[PDB]
Every structure is written in structure tokens, then in C-alpha cells.
Design a protein around this ligand. Structure first.
Ligand code: COA
Ligand code: MG
Ligand code: MG
Length: 720
């Protein structure tokens, strides 16, 4: 109670001061009125937030019980779901009306990067990732095998760099073909009569489609770069005969830059650990520096002191000679937490903590005002040309919960003195009660929705928890082939396209989690635009630039017109629970893999407040772990345990097997403290144990209650 009272709220000082001193100035909002609206909004919406949480609990207990009385009669099951209000009727057809949305969303198909907002260095990089080097992406990853002397080394390897160049030349041929011949034989480029002219050994050539020439830099007769466009994404050939790569190139080409992460999601949710006012202030401050345009982070390359800042916009000459400008930064969404958790950043008179999702709207809405204009006090950055603020709302269960978000935004808009529908919603489709009512969810947000996205990891976590009592589930790597998930994915696209999303809102698909396996990403992740998704999630800038390749090969707008108005998934498919028909080596492998990934993720969450980590699985595949991959592992094991496939002792023994391995993976991190051999003195080990043995008891299988409590424990113990 260094807490400032305002109405019935008791606001942590660090938050109060950050809001008044940093966030509020320049927004033209009177601070007294701000705080009294925070108070009114919290008092008015809290009881409905609680009622919606109680309803999830009520629905689950009814489902548990139904399974416990009960080979599933699917008609009887649908019926039961209809009677308790889980499965509601599908509304009449409609088209969404959302307006004031930027083209990066309504129109441009391309990769969407997600990043932990608490990590300024990564958050900057992500905003800067709208524009990335294809050469660095190819040279630095396994896309180009290290085969036939193309191995990376201390020095530029010309055998490898020549392979990169060729790979890029073919890409240029496929995306922006010349009228005659190949980019592989280009000797130079000029601009003549406002056309791109490409010099060959024969032969000068224009482009088969001259509308793919977007502009250039430098002199017409001797350009420093050539900007091209295909499928609404830009491609920049940098020309420099004198650069290290350029001198080795037939046309003195130094690099190919792809426009990649057209949008970026600055994440408050599953990729960060933020358990108290101090943690939330850290992320709100980074969100603030992003929208003001002044965020920075000291960066070290070869023991020289650099500063990472936001990219400035990019200046070009139009084909016909005028100057213009393309955005240097990807358009930023912010992902707020969902409806579940409270946070002690504010408590009321009785010391009850305030719902965090309510706070996130208020505070991330407030701070987003700075990126709606340029001024000294707002900073130079403008995030939206149309004045929209873009908020991803995760983990919603059903249309009532969407309507409640929309009402929250509406209430917040009045507090912030913003027009109604300024605050846009990106709806995660990642909970079962949302999937099976998806059209009504879209409908509840028909004037705010800017995206739907299959958050498949959370979605599998809910799948396991929802049917926890039905029997043992299949192994988690066997989920991808189950009818529920295949119908889920097609159904999401169907519903977005039937609601008129094409040309208006993103249809998005999920995250590639194998951070190092890029050759695989480039081979496999093309399926998502081919399925109609105008965007999909990538884990890094490098993965954005690589994924952009797929949007050049697939014409997603043409895909979408060819799928629109076609129903491909049925309710019954969507509701088919992934029940199993295992040898003990198969159970051992599943349990140990789940345990290893749990421990390796939780130990850095609890001990270090890192909410997204790269953690090798049992096969040494480096996986991106966040709360959602945790939700799956801990729910699958709780489900095996529930049904007697494994015992408690089994889980404990596995956890003891793998803790020493995680400790080894983490040695050479000077800040790491081992779990072994004193497992019970490890709050992080106990967290991982609790997530599994209490897993069935967690609401919707969510990991935040145990993780937030354990991280706070850990801070408290670090304090004395
Ligand atoms: C998995 C993850 C933690 C890997 O990062 P890591 O183990 O700490 O370190 P790596 O060596 O692989 O990469 C660090 C470098 O890549 C960049 N990087 C990695 N992920 C990035 C992201 N999302 N945005 C911007 N840059 C990123 C960093 O900026 C850094 O480059 P720099 O030295 O120039 O600053 C990570 O990619 C991440 O936190 N981001 C995306 C995941 C997400 O947001 N959701 C969770 C999905 S499972
Ligand atoms: Mg600004
Ligand atoms: Mg999710």
C-alpha cells in the first residue's frame, strides 16, 4: 500500500506514476477523468467478467459429469451441448462492416510476426522486420544446405553465397518474370521512358508485366536499387558493384530485400511472464516507446557499441520520376491478455485484484494514442494511417465473451475520448466454444473485427481439457491428423470468407515453432496461404522473410475467391474428440518428451520471468515454447494420469529423469540455477509438478494460475 486511492481502486504507485508521467501526457486526456473512467469501467464490467468465468466453470462441470455417466453417441452429445448452451445456433449470413482499417490488414497478404513486448531488442527487431534481407535469410539458415563445400564459416564463403544468389535469381524469375530471358543472366538495370530495362548478353528486356515495376533509387541511368512488387508485396534489388557480394555478382547485385512482416503483434500474453505491477509497467513502457517511435536497445556486435532503433520510412523514385515513401515498420497490433486473470497492479478496497484484461484495454488503448499522430510530445511515429488501434483478444469462449470484449472497447473508447470502433479486434479462434460458434463470434464483433486466427496450440489444450473425462487422448504429435483439427482449420477459413473477410480482414493461421528448421518451413508452411489464409504466424524476422516467399508463389486473393461461400467442415467433424483406440516405450517417450518440454520452459518462466523459450525436445528439435505449448503437454499428461495410462509416481520419476537434462541444456547460462538434485527446493520444479498433477483442476486447463503464483513465490523468495 504504496497505493494511490482513486474511487474504489488502490493503484500500485509504479503504475500510477508511469500512467500520469509517461503515458497520459500528449493524449489530451485529463488525468482525473482518466482515472475516474478506469474506476467506473472496472466497477461496471467486473461482475460480467466474473459471470462469464463462472459460466466456463459451469459448462465444464456439466461436460465432465456427462462423460462420467457415459462409445460416444454424437447425436446425443450435440443435443446435450445444445441444451446446456454450449453449442448455440448459427446466425443468419452477414458481412462485417469494420472500416478505417489499414491496407496491411484489409488487402496485403503476408507473414505476421509475434514478439514478447517485454524484450525491447526483439520488439524493435520485429517492428523493423517489415523489410528483411533474403540473402541473410538464405545464407544464415539450413534453407541452403551446407553440402558440397557450402558450409558457413569464419569468412564469407563464396560457394555458399553463390548458391544464395542463384536461389534469389530463380525467385525473381518466378515472381517478376522478364519479357524474355532470366535474371540469372542480367548484367545491369536501367530506367528508360519510365520502364525498367534489364540488360542481358543479347538483348535488353522489360518485365513481362511492367506494372510490377514500383520505383527505384539513385540515377535512372545507374540506379542504386530497383523496387518491384508482386501480389502486393515489394521486392528490392540493391545494386552495388563495389560491395563484397556485388563484385562477385554479374549485375553487381548486393542483396534482395523482401517486404515480410507487414504486421507484427506486440505480445502481452503467452510469450511474456508478467505477474505484478512492476512487470506490467515494463511491457506498457515498451508498448509506449514503440508508439512514440523512440524505443531503443543497446546492441553488441563484435564488442562495438550499437543502438537498435525503429527503422525510418523508405524513400523511392516513382517509375515516372516523382518521389514517394513506403513504411519502414510493420503495422503493430498489441495482444492483450484474455478474460481469466487478475493482477495486483490495482486492487479494490477489499484488496481484491482487478481483471487484467480490463486493465490491458485501458492502458494499451491509452498508450496507442501516441501512434495515431506525429508530434514532439507524441513522437514521430504513426502506426495507422486510418486512426485505428489494433488489439488481439486471445482465449475467448463463445459469442457472449466476444460481445463483452466489444463492450469493454466501447467503454474504453469513451474514457479515452476516441470515436466508437477505434479499437479493432483480432479474434483468436483458439478455444472450442469459439470454434463451434465461430460465425456468432464474428457477428458479435461485426463492426470491429480485423482478423480471425486459428491459435491451434491453445485450441489443442482446450480440446484435451474439454473432453478430459471422455478417456485417454492420442499422443500430442498425433493430434495434427485428427478430424477435429482438420475441420477446425477449414471451418475458420469458411466462416471468415462467408463473412466477407476477403478485402476487409485477415484470415490467419498459426505459428511455425521449429525455429531452426527453415528448409522445412519453406517446404511445408506454403500449405497455409494455399488454404486461403491471408496471413500466418512466424517466430522471427528470418522466418518472416522466408515465409514471404510463399505469398509470392501463392496468389491468396485468387485462392480466397475460389473458396468463398463453400462449406467444407461439419459440426460433427468439429466435435469429434481425439480419443485413442501404446507399448511402454511409446508411453515413456511421450511422458519424457512432455516432461522435458514442460521443465525447460517453466524453469526459465519461474526462475527468470522469461515467457517464451527455445527448448530442445526429446529428439533435439529446437521448439519455441510458450504457455500454449505448455497447456498442451501438461493437459495431455493430466489426461493420461486421469485415465490410469500413467501414475503419479510415473510423472514424478519422469520429471526427475529430465530435470538433469534441462539443467545441462542451461549450463553456461550464468543466471541459471539447477533443479537437480534437490527437486523439492526448486520452485520451478514444483511448478512443473503442480501443472501436471493439478492439471485437471485448472480452469480450461490454463497455466497462468499456477505460473503466476509460482513466479511470485520465486520473486518473494529472491527478495528476503
Ligand atoms: C523462440 C525465441 C525465444 C528464440 O529466441 P532466442 O532463443 O532468445 O535467441 P535466437 O538466437 O534464436 O535469436 C535471437 C536473435 O533473433 C532475433 N529474434 C528472435 N525472435 C524474434 C522476434 N520474435 N522478433 C524480433 N527478433 C527476434 C533477436 O532480435 C536476436 O537478434 P539480434 O541479436 O540482432 O537482437 C523467439 O524467436 C521469440 O521470443 N519470439 C517469437 C515467439 C512468440 O512471440 N510467440 C510464442 C510462440 S511458440
Ligand atoms: Mg506519434
Ligand atoms: Mg494461443
Amino acid at each position: 500500500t504504496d497505493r494511490v486511492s482513486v474511487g474504489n481502486l488502490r493503484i500500485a504507485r509504479v503504475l500510477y506514476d508511469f500512467v500520469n508521467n509517461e503515458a497520459l501526457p500528449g493524449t489530451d486526456i485529463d488525468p482525473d477523468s482518466f482515472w475516474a473512467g478506469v474506476d467506473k469501467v472496472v466497477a461496471d464490467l467486473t461482475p460480467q467478467n466474473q459471470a462469464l468465468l463462472n459460466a466456463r466453470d459451469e459448462l465444464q462441470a456439466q461436460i465432465d459429469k456427462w462423460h462420467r455417466r457415459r462409445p460416444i453417441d454424437m447425436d446425443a452429445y450435440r443435443q446435450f451441448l445444445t441444451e446446456i448452451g454450449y453449442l448455440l445456433p448459427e446466425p443468419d449470413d452477414f458481412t462485417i462492416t469494420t472500416s478505417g482499417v489499414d491496407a496491411e490488414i484489409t488487402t496485403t497478404a503476408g507473414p505476421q510476426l509475434v514478439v514478447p513486448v517485454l524484450n525491447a531488442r526483439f520488439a524493435l527487431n520485429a517492428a523493423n522486420a517489415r523489410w528483411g534481407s533474403l540473402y541473410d535469410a538464405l545464407y544464415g539458415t539450413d534453407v541452403i544446405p551446407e553440402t558440397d563445400g557450402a558450409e558457413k564459416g569464419p569468412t564469407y564463403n563464396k560457394v555458399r553465397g553463390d548458391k544464395v544468389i542463384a536461389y534469389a535469381r530463380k525467385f525473381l524469375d518466378d515472381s517478376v518474370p522478364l519479357s524474355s530471358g532470366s535474371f540469372g543472366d542480367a548484367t545491369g538495370f536501367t530506367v528508360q521512358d519510365g520502364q525498367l530495362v534489364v540488360a542481358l548478353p543479347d538483348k535488353s528486356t522489360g518485365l513481362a508485366n511492367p506494372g510490377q515495376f514500383a520505383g527505384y533509387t539513385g540515377a535512372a541511368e545507374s540506379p542504386t536499387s530497383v523496387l518491384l512488387i508482386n501480389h502486393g508485396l515489394h521486392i528490392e534489388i540493391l545494386i552495388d558493384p563495389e560491395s563484397q557480394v556485388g563484385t562477385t555478382d554479374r549485375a553487381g547485385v548486393k542483396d534482395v530485400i523482401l517486404e515480410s512482416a507487414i504486421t507484427t503483434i506486440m505480445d502481452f500474453e503467452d510469450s511474456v511472464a508478467a505477474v505484478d505491477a512492476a512487470d506490467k509497467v515494463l511491457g506498457y513502457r515498451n508498448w509506449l516507446g514503440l508508439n512514440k517511435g523512440d524505443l531503443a536497445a543497446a546492441v553488441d556486435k563484435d564488442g562495438t557499441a550499437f543502438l537498435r532503433v525503429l527503422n525510418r520510412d523508405r524513400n523511392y523514385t516513382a517509375p515516372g520520376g516523382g518521389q514517394f515513401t513506403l513504411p519502414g515498420r510493420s503495422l503493430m497490433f498489441v495482444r492483450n491478455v484474455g478474460h481469466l486473470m487478475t493482477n495486483d497492479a490495482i486492487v479494490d478496497t477489499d484488496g481484491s485484484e482487478v481483471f487484467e484484461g480490463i486493465m490491458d484495454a485501458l492502458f494499451t488503448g491509452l498508450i496507442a494514442i501516441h501512434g495515431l499522430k506525429a508530434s514532439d510530445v507524441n513522437g514521430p511515429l504513426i502506426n495507422s494511417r486510418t486512426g485505428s488501434i489494433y488489439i488481439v483478444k486471445p482465449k475467448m469462449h463463445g459469442p457472449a465473451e466476444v460481445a463483452f470484449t466489444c463492450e469493454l472497447f466501447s467503454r474504453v473508447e469513451d474514457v479515452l475520448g476516441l470515436p466508437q470502433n477505434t479499437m479493432k479486434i483480432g479474434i483468436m479462434d483458439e478455444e472450442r466454444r469459439t470454434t463451434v460458434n465461430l460465425k456468432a463470434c464474428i457477428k458479435a464483433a461485426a463492426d470491429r473485427v480485423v482478423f480471425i486466427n486459428t491459435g491451434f496450440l491453445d485450441r489443442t489444450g482446450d480440446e484435451i481439457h474439454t473432453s478430459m473425462e471422455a478417456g485417454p487422448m492420442v499422443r500430442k504429435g498425433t493430434m495434427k491428423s485428427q478430424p477435429w483439427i482438420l475441420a477446425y482449420e477449414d471451418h475458420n477459413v469458411d466462416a471468415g470468407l462467408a463473412a466477407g473477410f476477403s478485402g476487409r480482414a485477415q484470415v490467419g493461421k498459426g505459428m511455425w515453432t521449429m525455429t531452426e528448421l527453415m528448409a522445412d518451413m519453406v517446404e511445408t508452411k506454403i500449405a497455409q496461404p494455399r488454404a486461403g489464409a491471408s496471413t500466418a504466424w512466424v517466430p522471427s524476422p528470418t522466418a518472416a522473410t522466408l515465409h514471404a516467399l510463399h505469398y509470392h508463389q501463392v496468389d491468396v486473393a485468387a485462392v480466397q475467391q475460389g473458396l468463398a461461400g463453400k462449406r467444407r467442415a461439419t459440426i460433427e467433424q468439429l466435435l469429434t474428440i481425439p480419443l485413442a483406440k501404446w507399448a511402454p516405450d511409446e508411453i515413456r517417450e511421450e511422458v519424457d518428451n512432455n516432461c522435458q518440454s514442460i521443465l525447460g520452459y517453466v524453469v526459465r518462466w519461474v526462475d527468470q520471468g522469461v515467457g517464451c523459450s527455445k527448448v530442445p525436445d526429446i529428439h533435439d528439435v529446437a521448439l519455441m515454447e510458450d504457455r500454449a505449448t505448455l497447456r498442451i503437454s501438461s493437459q495431455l499428461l493430466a489426461n493420461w494420469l486421469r485415465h490410469g495410462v500413467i501414475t503419479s509416481a510415473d510423472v514424478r520419476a519422469s520429471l526427475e529423469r529430465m530435470a538433469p537434462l534441462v539443467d545441462r541444456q542451461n549450463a553456461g547460462d550464468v543466471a541459471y540455477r539447477p533443479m537437480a538434485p534437490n527437486f523439492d527446493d526448486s520452485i520451478a520444479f514444483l511448478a512443473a509438478q503442480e501443472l501436471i498433477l493439478s492439471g485437471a483442476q485448472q480452469p480450461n486447463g490454463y497455466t497462468e494460475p499456477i505460473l503466476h503464483r509460482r513466479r511470485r513465490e520465486f520473486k518473494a523468495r529472491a527478495a528476503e
